[PDB]
């Protein structure tokens, strides 16, 4: 499991405020490099990273039409949504598109993606086998059918495997310096000796990349969850990231709980304590 090209899309039906806000975001690992925010002066595809900027006019243009077109197809979807739900014409909503490909170091994608979400819940998604859909709610059921006969997956599958994998290695091969740069976390626990007879150890993990990580605590070997506390992986801005997990402990056990840090940059899973 190594690299990916993930494209994030959001259609936001803002009733009365005009046509839904449409936006596309391009990703490789945890890096936004391209964007398309409907509400813009020059509505071209934006180079949201310097490395991609090497791409010619043929690219940005060949992409603008891509986005702009999709915006229209979404408009339809949004409109059609209400119908499928008897919902008020004056109600706002969101249609989310998440399509990408997780390609392995050698070169073969480990997984292709093409999924949907209306507002927040999963709507319909192209399964693991890359050849079949999934219907969350009854609405999606219509779609699975619609898409089955039309052979919608076939058209997609060849992208995730095609231009996705094909453009992935290129986006990397021409901007790998800027990209790749893997960083390990520099963890360490803190010990707040607050009153109430209970002290809490906080295990931070900083300066890492990729963002994707895993962090935990182990009390004398015992795994613990319904007691732990972990903040979302917040970005450090400087290409790096931060994060942490905390566990309350009775003032006097301390040596009994230990934090774990697993990350690509790390050789073995980092175990520590206070």
């Amino acid at each position: 499991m190594s690299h990916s090209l993930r494209y994030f899309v959001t259609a936001v039906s803002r009733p009365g405020f005009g046509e839904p806000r449409y936006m596309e975001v391009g990703y490789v690992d945890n890096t936004e490099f391209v964007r398309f925010d409907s509400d813009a002066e020059n509505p071209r595809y934006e180079p949201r990273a310097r490395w991609i900027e090497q791409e010619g006019p043929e690219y940005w243009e060949r992409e603008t039409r891509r986005a702009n077109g999709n915006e229209q197809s979404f408009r339809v979807d949004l409109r059609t949504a209400l119908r499928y739900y008897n919902q008020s014409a004056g109600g706002s909503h969101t249609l989310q598109w998440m399509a990408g490909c997780d390609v392995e170091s050698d070169g073969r994608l480990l997984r292709g993606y093409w999924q949907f979400a209306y507002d927040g819940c999963d709507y319909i998604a192209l399964n693991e086998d890359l050849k079949t859909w999934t219907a969350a709610d009854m609405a999606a059921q219509i779609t699975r059918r619609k898409w089955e006969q039309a052979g919608a997956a076939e058209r997609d599958r060849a992208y995730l495997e095609g231009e996705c994998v094909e453009w992935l290695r290129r986006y990397l091969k021409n901007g790998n310096a800027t990209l790749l740069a893997t960083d390990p976390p520099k963890a360490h626990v803190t010990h707040h000796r607050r009153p109430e007879g209970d002290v809490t150890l906080r295990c931070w993990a900083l300066g890492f990349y990729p963002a994707e990580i895993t962090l935990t605590w182990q009390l004398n070997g015992e795994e613990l969850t319904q007691e732990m506390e972990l903040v979302e992986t917040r970005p450090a801005g400087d290409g790096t990231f931060q994060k942490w997990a905390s566990v309350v402990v009775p003032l006097g056990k301390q040596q009994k709980y230990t934090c774990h840090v697993e990350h690509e940059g790390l050789p073995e899973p980092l175990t520590l304590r206070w």
């Binding site: 391009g26 197809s73 339809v76 609405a139 619609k146 231009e163 453009w167």
Partner: peptide, 10 residues
């Protein structure tokens, strides 16, 4: 390159 809703709606 990004994917495209191939005008294959809901």
């Amino acid at each position: 390159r990004g994917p495209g809703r191939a005008f294959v709606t809901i």
